[PDB]
């Protein structure tokens, strides 16, 4: 039973690790959005 | 005027009977130095960026021609060189690249030496000195194949302080580790610190 | 002529608007880059271990 | 093998130096003569085909026919030939007999 | 005596507890000295091994460990702590600078002047004035390398004052480089003072 | 070997220590906590101001600079092949052994094509014994290469005329010059055929001069037996199997 | 085993502390966005 | 003249639009600043301790 | 990824090493002379057996 | 002898630990050979089956 | 200085214009004035002027 308990421990440990990886991927995507709009307005500035 | 070239140059261009050993009137092909002088005269009236473009194009053309001539004429014993990439591997310098890339003599030497070391280590170049290839540098080639890694491992000795981590240490005791988790709260109030 | 001088004032006010747009957007950019490339910190690897 | 080797050297050298396709060279030489030899007429036809392609922006077969050659009915045959492209797009009701 | 105080100092500096960090790091070092029994402490550092230059490592280079290197050479620890104090001062200064208030700018001026005072004056390049340009063979001369190794070994295990003149004409050696961290600190302080 | 490795490690440690003492940047209020060693004075008297001589970052004279990396690389790479073998570094590239180590040699930027061309020219000259102009004149008439003949002024003229006015529209707008110039010059300036290439393409091939023409058009190692392989033809001309089919 | 239990206690404690720090960083970034658009429209107002 | 008076009405209506834009945006600004600079409150440090 | 000059040189080194360990790839040869059989010829159970 | 080393290699490659992955995969294969007792290993692969 | 202020000319250009000669031997770490004027780039052969 306590081996099963440590199994749940490892389970939510790896689950929150994968949640951290999802957070990293979301941060990467939104950073891509940020520099994308940065160059958006970079070209808009020379147009202006 | 449209060609930005002298009228006598235009006359010379028109007078070229490109007949090349009969089938027409005659072979009016100029001599070699006459060809060179005519090219100079007709090209002398261009711009600057066009001049660099022509220089790069001529450089690439002569590079390819010289590579072909070397491949078809000069073949040192023990090397079956038959291609541009064969010449690249043999001379440790790239011959099929554009003129846009710029580098230094020492950087080119780094590239050539690294390529030669890889060729010798991967046992693809025959008659390699396997006795020499088992030194400390080749064993540490994983960190010696790049200038950045070699520079870092070299600086680690003379300036170890830059790589000293005040938050963790190799061989840190588990009791100090649990102290670290007990001190890594969000905001560290004084009483919590002394606790 | 005065009208079009005012119009030039309009357009260069707009380009100043976009310059400080660059300021704010680039600030966002380095903030997000710092968040992403640091990723997971020593406290979180301590918790995992 | 020496003479045909030299012929293929000629053909591949001209194709590489002028951008000519093998089937374009084939139709040019077939329209010139069945001997498959290289003379001034073949290179003049190539000249005028390239010249028309540069200015009038015409296809190789179109410019070749325009400079004096005939329409190639038997192309590489993996696709539509020139004769079929001109008079069989599509056939009206019956098979072409021209 | 050494690792835990900087553990707390690093945590406090990361969590912007500047005065608590300074008070805690005063346990290991204080530029204004130490006040023991109401009198000026004669010692400069409040850590005995650091003050006495005591080494507690025999084979630091057997593995890639800056911690082992610093254990072998104790005063690298002193350099690390000094740079940590400098970093704390710089964070104090620019945190004051953040709000752009007049009093905050005056406080940042005070912090930056104190940082310059404790930093002193930086030196410049001198070996580049007269360093010769040797050939690749001269640089890779194994005989010169072995001679330098022998000189270093005989200076290390001995202390011999003979061989007074080393004939510097043997140009196959390099010179130590200044600290990139220190140069970055100097440039940052210069630009802050300019602003 | 254990003794050698320990000796090198100890020497590196001593060098790092002495450079730490000799670093002038540490003055510095911490200079009061720095002492001068007897070994430090011994090093000073032995090597003059070597310990006190420092360089700025990026200087070619530093050991952390790429110059030292290259020095060590050559030191370890000088003997990967025996000096008798053609694969030896010195044998294949004698020009590398006498490379100058200067700040300008790594600060100046130049195209890699320039270095490759100069190396090829050096090899061609040391082999043949001629000049660059003679080499160009021979290449404009060479026959034993797929790229040859290469007429450099002709190529320059063609490129310049293409850059100025393609399709010769300006010349066509002036018909009086067409009565004096025929299509031969126009073909020369439009397509890529040197006079030597024209001569090669318009020479009859018969069994009477078959072997002579083969020897003229190909090297001594290029025989019909070698040519009989389709893969050989593809790898010789840089073409593809379906293209030669 | 109960020492391991207190280990998981400290683990999720520090994990949610770091989550709080991530929340603080996100708040700081979005506050930067807010005052950025504030000055955006500050300049737009004088243009108008 | 009446047309351009109406146009002036348009533009100053727009600047009033942007003034109350400032009102809303600055309200957001102080709300977010108050959230960030307060950060973690005594209840949360109590839970942590 | 980072498009630095030294990074591009390192990528060149890696790609050259990959080509070296990969060798040279072959091409199609059976398509040169493979005949076109009928459906009965393809499905001949006697030939299959 | 075979499955675990690539388990670690795949994890390291997925997590961008390139040099650690290379060092770990050297246990099963190395194009530059193997250095045993300070001598060139005659075998090509470091896995007996 | 006077020519640099009005005609916006380089120091070497204005120096040559006021009566001095073109400096062939510059600081030599970069292109000289003579090479900047007649060697950008050399046509086919080395300059002899």
Residue numbers in the entry:
A (entry chain C), G (entry chain D): 2200 to 2247
B (entry chain B): 881 to 1075
C (entry chain C), H (entry chain D): 2102 to 2150
D (entry chain B): 441 to 538
E (entry chain B): 1809 to 2003
F (entry chain B): 50 to 294
I (entry chain A): 1906 to 1954
J (entry chain A): 1809 to 1857
Give verbatim excerpts from the published study on this entry.
The TcAs are the largest subunits of the complex and contain a translocation channel with hydrophobic loops at the end allowing for membrane permeation. Upon TcA binding and an environmental pH change, the complex undergoes a conformational change into an active state in which the translocation channel is exposed and pierces the target cell membrane.
To optimize the natural peptide shuttling and translocation mechanism of Xn-XptA2, our first strategy consisted of inserting the pharmacophore sequence of the TATE region of the DOTATATE peptide into the outermost loops of the NDs to alter the targeting potential of Xn-XptA2. The immunoreactive fraction was observed to be 2.8%, indicating no specific binding of Xn-XptA2 YWKT to SSTR2. To test whether the structural integrity of Xn-XptA2 YWKT was intact, we solved the structure to 4.3 Å resolution using cryo-EM single particle analysis (SPA). The biggest deviation in structure lies between G298 and P440. The structural rearrangement of RBD A in Xn-XptA2 YWKT consists mainly of a significant loss in secondary structure in the form of β-sheets. In contrast, β-sheets in the Xn-XptA2 YWKT RBD A are only observed at positions G328-V335 and I433-P440 with the former regions of β-sheets rearranging into loops. RBD A is ~130 angstroms and 742 residues away from the outer loops of the ND at the YWKT insertion site (P440-T1181), indicating that disruption of these outer loops has an allosteric effect on upstream domains. Comparatively, in the Xn-XptA2 YWKT structure, the narrowest constriction point in the pore has a maximum radius of 4.6 Å and is also compressed by four amino acids from two separate protomers: D518 (Chain A), Q152 (Chain E), Q294 (Chain A), and K291 (Chain A).
